[PDB]
Design a protein around this ligand. Structure first.
Ligand code: HEC
Ligand code: HEC
Ligand code: HEC
Ligand code: HEC
Ligand SMILES: [Ca+2]
Ligand SMILES: [Ca+2]
Ligand SMILES: [Ca+2]
Ligand SMILES: [Ca+2]
Ligand SMILES: [Ca+2]
Ligand SMILES: [Ca+2]
Ligand SMILES: [Ca+2]
Ligand SMILES: [Ca+2]
Ligand SMILES: [Ca+2]
Ligand SMILES: [Ca+2]
Ligand SMILES: [Ca+2]
Ligand SMILES: [Ca+2]
Ligand SMILES: [Ca+2]
Ligand SMILES: [Ca+2]
Ligand SMILES: [Ca+2]
Ligand SMILES: [Ca+2]
Ligand SMILES: [Ca+2]
Ligand SMILES: [Ca+2]
Ligand SMILES: [Zn+2]
Ligand SMILES: [Zn+2]
Ligand SMILES: [Zn+2]
Ligand SMILES: [Zn+2]
Ligand SMILES: [Zn+2]
Ligand SMILES: [Zn+2]
Ligand SMILES: [Zn+2]
Ligand SMILES: [Zn+2]
Lengths: 91, 91, 91, 91
């Protein structure tokens, strides 16, 4: 839908993952992030950024589905360099 | 050689890249970083971390050799998530 | 839809790419392949195979959209090792 | 050393892997292949081809070192699309 609202969803749920205790909290937070990226996926270049982000989130869901909470949390932190790469280029 | 001294080399040269103006400054700083990672490349796991870092630095040298200073600087910032992944795991 | 019919679509269109002359022939053939893989994307493991294939086809569409017919043809041949990896494992 | 002799080493040892029974046969064959690629690593482009091949062989050694003979054999077959990509371009 809206771009600013997609960024809010991504930024807010990333903290929910950082503060999560179990796999169900992580698995749900990533599902909202995946939906916000695919929704933003709509010069590009810019659009391929969101394609990369969808992939990384997707691989983190496997970890959460297997019960690997610690590694799912580790994988979510590596997303930040995709986030920053866009900002550093298109801002 | 020593591990603490390899980390100093990596951390100091990363800033030299951030503050660089031309390609020759970036190209030289990455060459010292590549040498410090390969030197540290000597459970692992831990050692594969340095293998990933060598690859990313290697691809950044192509950008600097082609005169792409801005993108070489962008590529150097993406290294940080490799740096942090080790620290978050083995510390 | 059906699995055997998805494999036919993939195998037939891959030859259409190999025999293609212009970008419009390649771009259209990849679009049918992408649809057949995403359709087959429905233990896994097995299912992640189709996720990898979707990504590789996706990157080949950029080449075809930029007019790079030769490289789009090169990228389509690298798909075959994904194809064979599944067969060698699950057959 | 010589290019034609490096290709012989790669092609011959690849079959030794395909016909291997235990991990020690696979682990040794990959070690000769890794040496032949790094030796050939000496426009490029062409040279980056050998850089990619070194990486893939390197990851296959982990599998062989962990006793995963079947997957090490699978990983060795995926090398062929790197082999063919060079030939299709520079021949
Ligand atoms: C990945 C995990 C993230 C996170 C957490 C954020 N982004 Fe982006 N972002 C992009 C652009 C062009 C802007 C500016 C336009 C706008 O204001 O929406 C932003 C902005 C943000 C914000 C600030 C929004 C605000 O309230 O003012 C935040 C918090 C934010 N981002 C977080 C562009 C991109 C990308 C382009 C390819 C990618 C990828 C990301 N952002 C990824 C992320
Ligand atoms: C990549 C670009 C980097 C950078 C800039 C740094 N590291 Fe590491 N690091 C690792 C470990 C186990 C330690 C603790 C042991 C030690 O003290 O040497 C560190 C420590 C550091 C420091 C602090 C050193 C000090 O003076 O006390 C700094 C500044 C530093 N690192 C920077 C382990 C790893 C890795 C393991 C796989 C990887 C990769 C990195 N570090 C990468 C980086
Ligand atoms: C990628 C480009 C390809 C291509 C060209 C093909 N495949 Fe597959 N495939 C898979 C399985 C389990 C089967 C057996 C089940 C079945 O018969 O459908 C196949 C079979 C085929 C065929 C033969 C179909 C027939 O008519 O009998 C062909 C021509 C074929 N494939 C082409 C499984 C997979 C995968 C699993 C992850 C992947 C990926 C692919 N195949 C990819 C490809
Ligand atoms: C990866 C696993 C492989 C394997 C098994 C082979 N290659 Fe290459 N190759 C390249 C070039 C330019 C040539 C022609 C020059 C020459 O004759 O040496 C070749 C040739 C071969 C041969 C034939 C050699 C002969 O006896 O005439 C064979 C058997 C062979 N290759 C196997 C270039 C490249 C690459 C460039 C980047 C890469 C990568 C590979 N080859 C990889 C492989
Ligand atoms: Ca806001
Ligand atoms: Ca809001
Ligand atoms: Ca808002
Ligand atoms: Ca909590
Ligand atoms: Ca992908
Ligand atoms: Ca110190
Ligand atoms: Ca010092
Ligand atoms: Ca010191
Ligand atoms: Ca300066
Ligand atoms: Ca059939
Ligand atoms: Ca049919
Ligand atoms: Ca049929
Ligand atoms: Ca034709
Ligand atoms: Ca010969
Ligand atoms: Ca010989
Ligand atoms: Ca010879
Ligand atoms: Ca045998
Ligand atoms: Ca590598
Ligand atoms: Zn894209
Ligand atoms: Zn980890
Ligand atoms: Zn390694
Ligand atoms: Zn950039
Ligand atoms: Zn998957
Ligand atoms: Zn090519
Ligand atoms: Zn290279
Ligand atoms: Zn396998």
């Amino acid at each position: 839908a809206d771009l600013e609202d997609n960024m809010e969803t991504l930024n807010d749920n990333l903290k929910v993952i950082e503060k999560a205790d179990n796999a169900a909290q992580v698995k749900d937070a990533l599902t909202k992030m995946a939906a916000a990226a695919a929704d933003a996926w709509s010069m590009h270049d810019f659009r391929h950024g969101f394609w990369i982000l969808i992939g990384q989130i997707h691989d983190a869901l496997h970890l959460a589905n297997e019960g690997k909470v610690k590694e799912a949390q580790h994988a979510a932190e590596q997303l930040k360099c995709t986030c920053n790469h866009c900002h550093q280029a298109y801002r």
